[PDB]
Subunit: 365 residues, 4 copies
């Protein structure tokens, strides 16, 4: 077998060490734009998010209301593919035609839209019924697709991406994953993926141990994939955006993920807490909660995972603004006005096993 | 004294990183056959389990019902030697002649059997009364034997194996152990053991600390012994199968043990939970349990250990099938269709002390 | 991004290994004097504390009573700058003119005073209203100033120090910070700071995680900054005193901080517990407590942090004497009669993650 | 300051890996004799314990009854020096003349005795009143002395040993300590100590943190001192026995300490639990306990430490026999018939931070 020189680490094990903060670096001047799909050296990505956040490909997270609310703030949602093809396509259609009208024939500056001023939206696909699902999603106006899988290091993803390239060329964008090391990244890169998703085991509703025992600390996975991605860019001139998917517990984990090289972040739990998630708001002994279940739970694929509750946080807007203000502020502490500058200048340290306690409040009531 | 460069590690500290999964790798096509006894280069083992699981040499685990139920699924049981010679021989006889008849003279495709279609069965032996016990076990039809001891790195095991080789040549198969490093493996190998058992301290009912303070993390022990075993094979052309005995807490620990090089796994607690274990099913406040005690407990050698209870799991069959389906699935994630292929391709990483939390469910109710 | 070879560590992870204790080293002969502001090689600092302790620049810690009580024992207080300029200046004035009289016009041997026998006092300043605040503090008789910030690695601190040097030359002393590595130290050194404050995240009332995720273990930060400070001294002949700010939980952490190279220590919680802190003494179910809130709490900047309680410890005097007696005693165990000698001779070891338990009381009721 | 390449470790972090156990190694044939005082190459120590255990120099442990009971089993006690000179001398006298008679003038094979068949006994001394105390202890018949201190790396110990050598030459044996590294060992060795005591912080009733912050993991201290001791022996031909003092929680820690090179072990808590300790047997809610307080507690030096209770274990004899049987058994697992052979052959591994759980009982009720 093959072993590694170092054990893997998660986001909670790192802290950012400040760099020189210049007078021009104030939160309001920080630009959080980031590339969504691959491009060649010297070019810009055809699709750029205005904020580096995308909602997870999950029944309990990315419905049409979520896709609209997130696109309004500059991010994009990946409508879950764990439903009928007709049903998923309808959600995509509804998001693409939201600015049309509520009836029949009887102003956000950071909104993410296409040349027709329509909100951008993504859609998850699987390696099974893609020959039928993909065309339906394209016709519905889906702006980007993403193969949804726990282990993307599969010949099935290569076949799926190939079928798409052969039928649509580079006109249909498709993300692939998840992978956790350079090998996996490289395989999906050569296969043609437009962006590669990183992460296995990190998800809040994912229990590696009580399952198959596959996975890797999210930080180590990101750092490793990013290095491979950069090597790949140098060899081929092709820059493939990568997504850190899962494991985000605190807002600062977002800054860490971006600093380590992730272009954007995929979150489930974070977004499930919002009013706009498709789940039910349930009140439990004075506490308003929201349902949250993984795609691996029996409750999902009935059309490996856990079914739970997350505290209600209110509307997506105020929460995302609060989170990103903290990211922007930290970026300035690091001397960065943009994500690429942060990825270049960030000073990232690992913290001791016997520590972390000093970081929080201690010896006080 | 002699010290080591690295501290030892247990199974819970590792995770498997996926490899390329090909289209032909589906769980149902995974072959879990594995060698039980040593053979020369270019040959096949005279005895091959159909599944890499064997039940522990314990009074509370391997009785005749267990031996039958496990052999039916492709594994083998080692009838405990902590009983009279006449008593142990009778159990072996009963298993060997089960397909004869229930009265007097008045279709499982993965069953493990001999050329006479009789279920295979093993039997534990000790370094004391082997001159009387061995012959009785052979006459009873025991297919394989195994010296049962916590520290097999002993001249007593060499003497026992020698007496067997001198009286039966290579016609009687005998496993030896337990050992935890290359030195111990090598000693029992040169002594003639047909398979070597790995593990000291890992057992669920074993408390190293509150005892002698001998032992080693099961993962490190396996990895070390396997390297020595491979070196030995290269020098002599003799391949000695090794058994990871104890420390298996979760199903994925099985995949880990095999990936690290263990040919098969010995379990006690896992099998004690089944209907077929010889212990009593006792109901405690709505919870049906089964008794489980170690061979080192006073409750056993009365014919060092602990006496406890394990939750009833039902019949052996459905449980073993569920466990192995998960192993097979993980093997495909690793790009392996067989155990040898898994041992060759597995990518095994250690996980941080400050982690493991990310792996399971977190920040959710 | 930039990574490090070792994870950071906190004070709780270290222990001092004794050196040769000579007959002349008794606690009463230990000199705890230490430099407060920078000087050139061959000179002495214009200001020397008699004890290496200074109270934090916080509303709940350094009021006029605290400044007087601490100066009497040989330390200095930094009157909080999170109040009106007129208000802060009045506190400084009151401390400077305390030995004048209680009415109107109708003997501590370790006291820290100026050439006029008046108690020394410091005052915190910010990078915003310094053009108005500084002059007012100088006129009031402030002996030393200190820019109060969580991330001193800022162009704003350079501008502030510059404005001070241009208007007052080297006649007005100003400390800067906080920083946690050589880079940050070097930047503030070249900027002209008279002393540099070390520490981000360590504070008892500071929660890095639930915030921005910036920081570093206090021990590692001190050790790193001190090495840079020593390198800087060798290159320029300028010795810049450094302050370990925050993270002190136990008295021995004080000895550790000094041994690692910190010239003096800044504490908040430690001093808040005293009668002389400006907060209210509140009795909670038989326990007399004192309020303690960080400057980052909403309760403070209303003229990021937490509001809490700390157990009442009584008057500053008896507590500081008890603490320093322990430091002095430990210094002799290390063969040191002075702080510089301790920094030179201390033998400092890191302790294992799996330990620390042996250090305290164990296996006893 | 001076730092180290590795963090220190305690006994709980190690396990012994078995070696070849020969047929002649049975517990009853294991010899636990060990040297108490220094000797030259080619010679034997003038005093050899029959078992490697000595009771701590504590008021709550080593009284006359303890000294008698322990000497009967082959060990020696160090009558506490924290009492009047007349009082301590009387205890020594009583032990030396126990085989005389209970009234006035009106058969253990492992007993430790002198040429007059009298039980051996030791006595602790301090660096203060030794000019009066020593003569009184010698006249009383004390067989060996030991300077009692938490930091033996002191010029005071050199002066004390010197005064003894000048007045008695090498006729009076005196141990010194405690130290935790090669430097300290070397200093007391050159000073003339007959044996050197290792350990600071390990004691069950010692709380390093809540004190001065001096100390080192007991295992690391022993390993380091032993290496220095062996180097010293090679350079001078003088073999100085060393004592691992404190930190023994389990019986296997005894085997570990000896395997790492300690010639003998000093214990406090272990012996306090016995009927023969001078403290009071107190019954607390059905549990018979014994008082146990450190020499650093105010309760002691009233003629830094804690006052507590330890569960009653009964008579010293049965307990020491049980403990040593386990040590002897483990020694055979390691292929050792004597302590020197164990120190030479022991294979000692460190165990992972994330482990230790596997070692004990797990996943069972
Ligand atoms: C597919 O959605 C995921 C993803 C993206 C991830 C994980 C996961 O468990 C599931 C659910 C797993 C399912 C439905 C089993 C099918 C499969 O193999 O894909 C994970 O651990 O990392 C990433
Ligand atoms: C023999 O069965 C075992 C085995 C196989 C192992 C251990 C163990 O404790 C016992 C019971 C120990 C007994 C009955 C003491 C006799 C002996 O020395 O064999 C263990 O720790 O690793 C493996
Ligand atoms: C300024 O006072 C501090 C200091 C000195 C430190 C920290 C901190 O949180 C605050 C409060 C932080 C505030 C009021 C936000 C403004 C700022 O950015 O300065 C810390 O973590 O290390 C040192
Ligand atoms: C002297 O007895 C000890 C010993 C042997 C040790 C320690 C200790 O705390 C005390 C009590 C400490 C006292 C009475 C203070 C006087 C002194 O300095 O000796 C310890 O930590 O390691 C070893
Ligand atoms: N284990 C499951 O059932 C399941 N369902 C989804 N997931 C993974 O977890 C991610 C969400 O993680 P989280 O809640 O944001 O930590 C998803 O985008 C996906 O990669 N895991
Ligand atoms: N300590 C004991 O009393 C005892 N009895 C059996 N054992 C060991 O534990 C193994 C079972 O481990 P487990 O329950 O499967 O974790 C046995 O095969 C044996 O090697 N240990
Ligand atoms: N987080 C906050 O609100 C806050 N307020 C003050 N501080 C920092 O904490 C220090 C006090 O730490 P402590 O209480 O002594 O551990 C201050 O000197 C400052 O550097 N942090
Ligand atoms: N801290 C104290 O008050 C105190 N008193 C004794 N000791 C140390 O602890 C040892 C006993 O340790 P333990 O109880 O056996 O773990 C003593 O021999 C001595 O070195 N420490
Ligand atoms: K900065
Ligand atoms: K795969
Ligand atoms: K000393
Ligand atoms: K052995
Ligand atoms: Na903190
Ligand atoms: Na998880
Ligand atoms: Na202790
Ligand atoms: Na165990």
């Amino acid at each position: 077998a093959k072993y590694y020189n170092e054990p893997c680490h998660t986001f909670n094990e790192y802290l950012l060490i400040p760099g020189l903060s210049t007078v021009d670096c104030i939160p309001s001047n920080v630009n959080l734009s980031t590339p969504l799909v691959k491009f060649q050296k010297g070019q810009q990505s055809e699709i750029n998010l205005k904020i580096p956040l995308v909602s997870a490909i999950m029944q309990s997270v990315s419905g049409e209301k979520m896709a609209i609310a997130l696109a309004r703030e500059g991010g994009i949602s990946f409508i879950f593919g764990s439903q009928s093809i007709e049903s998923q396509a309808a959600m995509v259609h509804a998001v693409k035609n939201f600015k049309a009208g509520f009836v029949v024939s009887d102003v956000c500056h950071n909104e993410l839209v296409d040349s027709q001023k329509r909100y951008l939206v993504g859609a998850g696909i699987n390696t099974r019924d893609f020959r039928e699902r993909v065309p339906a999603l394209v016709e519905a106006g889906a702006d980007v697709l993403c193969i949804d899988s726990s282990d993307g290091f599969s010949e099935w993803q290569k076949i799926t991406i190939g079928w798409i390239r052969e039928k649509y060329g580079d006109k249909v964008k498709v993300g692939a994953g998840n992978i956790v090391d350079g090998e996996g990244f490289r395989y999906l890169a050569d296969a043609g993926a437009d962006f590669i998703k990183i992460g296995i085991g990190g998800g809040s509703i994912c229990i590696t141990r009580e399952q198959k025992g596959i996975g890797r600390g999210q930080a180590t996975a990101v750092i490793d994939v990013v290095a491979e991605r950069n090597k790949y860019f140098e060899e081929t001139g092709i820059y493939i955006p990568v997504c850190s998917d899962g494991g985000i517990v605190y807002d600062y984990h977002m800054t860490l993920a971006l600093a380590m090289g992730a272009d954007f972040i995929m979150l489930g739990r974070y977004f499930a807490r919002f009013e706009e998630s498709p789940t039910r708001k349930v009140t439990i002994n004075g506490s308003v909660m929201k349902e949250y279940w993984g795609e691996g739970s029996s409750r999902a694929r009935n059309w490996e995972g856990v079914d739970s509750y997350v505290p209600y946080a209110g509307k997506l807007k105020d929460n995302v603004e609060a989170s990103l203000n903290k990211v922007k502020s930290t970026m300035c502490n690091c001397g960065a006005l943009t994500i690429p500058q942060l990825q270049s200048k960030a000073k990232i340290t690992l913290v001791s096993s016997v520590s972390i306690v000093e970081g929080g409040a201690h010896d006080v009531i």
